[PDB]
Amino acid sequence: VPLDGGRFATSDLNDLYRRVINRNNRLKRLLDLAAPDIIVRNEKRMLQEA
Amino acid sequence: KDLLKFLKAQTKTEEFDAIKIALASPDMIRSWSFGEVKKPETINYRTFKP
Amino acid sequence: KSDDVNGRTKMYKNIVDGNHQMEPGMPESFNVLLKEIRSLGINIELED
Amino acid sequence: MKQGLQLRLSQQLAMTPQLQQAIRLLQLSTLELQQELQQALESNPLLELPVYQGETTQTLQDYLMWQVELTPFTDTDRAIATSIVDAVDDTGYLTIQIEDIVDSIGDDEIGLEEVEAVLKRIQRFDPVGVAAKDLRDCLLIQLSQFAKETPWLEEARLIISDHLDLLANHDFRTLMRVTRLKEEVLKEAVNLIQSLDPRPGQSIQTSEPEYVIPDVLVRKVSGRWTVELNADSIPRLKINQQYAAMGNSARNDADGQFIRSNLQEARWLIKSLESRNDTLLRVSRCIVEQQQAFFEQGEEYMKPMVLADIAQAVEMHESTISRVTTQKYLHSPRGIFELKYFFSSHVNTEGGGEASSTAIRALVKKLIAAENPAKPLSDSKLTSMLSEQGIMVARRTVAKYRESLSIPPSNQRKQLV
DNA sequence: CCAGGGCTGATCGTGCAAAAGTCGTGCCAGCCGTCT
DNA sequence: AGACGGCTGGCACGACTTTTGCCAGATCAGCCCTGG
Numbered sequence A: 001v002p003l004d005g006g007r008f009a010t011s012d013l014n015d016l017y018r019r020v021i022n023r024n025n026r027l028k029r030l031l032d033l034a035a036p037d038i039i040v041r042n043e044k045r046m047l048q049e050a
Numbered sequence B: 001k002d003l004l005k006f007l008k009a010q011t012k013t014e015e016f017d018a019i020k021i022a023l024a025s026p027d028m029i030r031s032w033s034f035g036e037v038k039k040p041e042t043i044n045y046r047t048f049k050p
Numbered sequence C: 001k002s003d004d005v006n007g008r009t010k011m012y013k014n015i016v017d018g019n020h021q022m023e024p025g026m027p028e029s030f031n032v033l034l035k036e037i038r039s040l041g042i043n044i045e046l047e048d
Numbered sequence D: 001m002k003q004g005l006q007l008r009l010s011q012q013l014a015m016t017p018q019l020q021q022a023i024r025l026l027q028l029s030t031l032e033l034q035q036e037l038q039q040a041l042e043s044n045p046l047l048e049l050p051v052y053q054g055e056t057t058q059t060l061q062d063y064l065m066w067q068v069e070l071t072p073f074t075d076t077d078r079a080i081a082t083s084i085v086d087a088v089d090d091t092g093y094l095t096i097q098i099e100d101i102v103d104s105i106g107d108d109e110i111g112l113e114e115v116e117a118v119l120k121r122i123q124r125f126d127p128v129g130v131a132a133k134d135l136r137d138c139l140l141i142q143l144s145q146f147a148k149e150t151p152w153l154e155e156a157r158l159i160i161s162d163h164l165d166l167l168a169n170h171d172f173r174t175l176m177r178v179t180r181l182k183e184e185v186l187k188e189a190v191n192l193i194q195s196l197d198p199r200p201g202q203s204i205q206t207s208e209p210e211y212v213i214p215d216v217l218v219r220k221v222s223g224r225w226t227v228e229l230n231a232d233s234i235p236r237l238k239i240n241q242q243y244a245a246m247g248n249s250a251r252n253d254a255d256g257q258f259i260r261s262n263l264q265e266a267r268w269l270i271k272s273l274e275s276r277n278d279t280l281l282r283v284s285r286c287i288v289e290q291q292q293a294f295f296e297q298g299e300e301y302m303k304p305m306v307l308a309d310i311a312q313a314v315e316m317h318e319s320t321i322s323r324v325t326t327q328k329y330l331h332s333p334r335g336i337f338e339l340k341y342f343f344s345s346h347v348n349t350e351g352g353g354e355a356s357s358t359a360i361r362a363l364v365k366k367l368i369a370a371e372n373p374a375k376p377l378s379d380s381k382l383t384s385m386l387s388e389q390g391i392m393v394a395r396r397t398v399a400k401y402r403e404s405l406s407i408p409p410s411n412q413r414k415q416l417v
Numbered sequence E: 001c002c003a004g005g006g007c008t009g010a011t012c013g014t015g016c017a018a019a020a021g022t023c024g025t026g027c028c029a030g031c032c033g034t035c036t
Numbered sequence F: 001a002g003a004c005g006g007c008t009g010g011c012a013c014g015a016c017t018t019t020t021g022c023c024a025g026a027t028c029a030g031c032c033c034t035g036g
Helices: A014-031 A037-049 B006-010 B026-032 C005-017 C028-038 D017-024 D030-043 D060-069 D075-086 D098-105 D112-123 D136-145 D153-162 D164-168 D172-179 D187-194 D200-204 D253-290 D292-297 D307-312 D318-324 D357-369 D379-389 D395-404
Strands: B017-023 C042-047 D216-219 D226-229 D329-332 D335-338 D346-348 D354-356
Touching: A014 A037, A014 D030, C005 D060, C028 C042, D017 D253, D017 D318, D060 D075, D060 D200, D075 D098, D075 D112, D098 D112, D136 D153, D153 D164, D153 D172, D153 D187, D164 D172, D216 D253, D226 D253, D253 D292, D253 D307, D253 D318, D307 D318, D346 D357, D354 D357, D357 D379, D357 D395, D379 D395
Parallel strands: D216 D329
Antiparallel strands: B017 C042, D216 D226, D329 D335, D346 D354
């Protein structure tokens, strides 16, 4: 349902999905790099909140 | 395909008695799903394709 | 008169042909509700 | 005067792999840049009512299926009609041929005559001349539909039957001597053929959206326009304070080195992105400075330029400017163009000056358009009046410009007055 | 306790050139208009 | 009806543009070890 046509600007159902997807991607690619415990736990906390 | 029963199979429904509800297992979710999403991008604005 | 997609066209055809018969089927909003519930970790389906 | 291995320095150069990555970072557009930038953001951890439920629209295929639902076909006829209408383009002409449709059905009983019967049954649907095999059997349907009372109908049918090439080549004299038809009384019959709505299925829905994205902005401040970058479109990265304030506190060497390396990489990336933005802005400002006349006066008043001309005005290299000016769309009051569109080949004119190729092409466009319809202007005459203007390009270049402009040759566009 | 030596990492750097590509302009072949 | 002139396009040939593909090292400053 685009507003101005140039950009659709999906809202209220895709913003949450985008947040979850990008945060999960960052956490997954940070988990295998032997990241520090504080950073990985903080990222997991934000994933839980999302 | 004979193209004459393929069209008739589209418009069909079950008896659908006694709807139930229960907790979903990860195996059940993977059975529901057809693929896994990996990127937050929704639509490309260069070609307007999925 | 509503979201029964496969039934609206059939009723219109029967009315134009002069039959006045109904094929009820199943509303689309109930399918939408089932999909929205399954989008949460809750299994739900219709038995037989 | 010899062959001998010799050596003498006059140049200097140096580069590293991460510098190569940073220099290729500016070759690509912003929308494609953001994908790779998000990819690096995902790897580096210390870097960082509404309208819904629109209406359903009625396209041509849906409308034709709707009309099929209310017509009395058998089950086999309905399946054939569904396949046929599925194989229908937006313009209204079916894409695959009838034997292909028969193969798609794949039934021994199904025959070409049966498929023809069903197709001709659906030919009479609301958009007349829809689902026609080609142009020949689309105009003929409407000619047959029109009542016999209007004149020149038989003439129009005779021309449209088997003289399609004869009309397409605009060879009116041979068309006359082939049809034995009236002199200059055929013009109204040809006009009747003209007023026949080719491509009838197009008019079922014509909504086209607006898809424009600007990379560089220019606005006229009462003369000597100044150029600004797109604030929303430009990317930007910000260092993360939480993780930047825990590298020293950590007492583990592994964690400390991890945070140090990621800080180094993030700062280098931020610096490279800022440098790319600055270089793009400088290049855009310089090209708009050298193209101030064209924005004011039009395309045909454009001075030719080469990458050397714009590279000498700055301290960058020709290769650097070429890499920057790819897939960049700048927005101007006249419209949206590309940064690479400005550069063009030059041709020498009379008096020692040179004229840009695109300018001469636009001039040829307007000169050809503003011509008498009875006598077309050919390439040689075009060269002649261009030489009169003083441009004196060759007839070969005139033909190339006319062809790239998609205008057919002069002898092809001749028409009855 | 103060000064000299070692050592490690932090910091600097967006151009040169070779080859593909594009440009303009000529040469020649094939189809068409027209007078004899 | 045939020849002559003309128009158009494919192909070729210099002349000039533009596009990509290169892959570190030395040098300096602060800290630690050690001699006076």
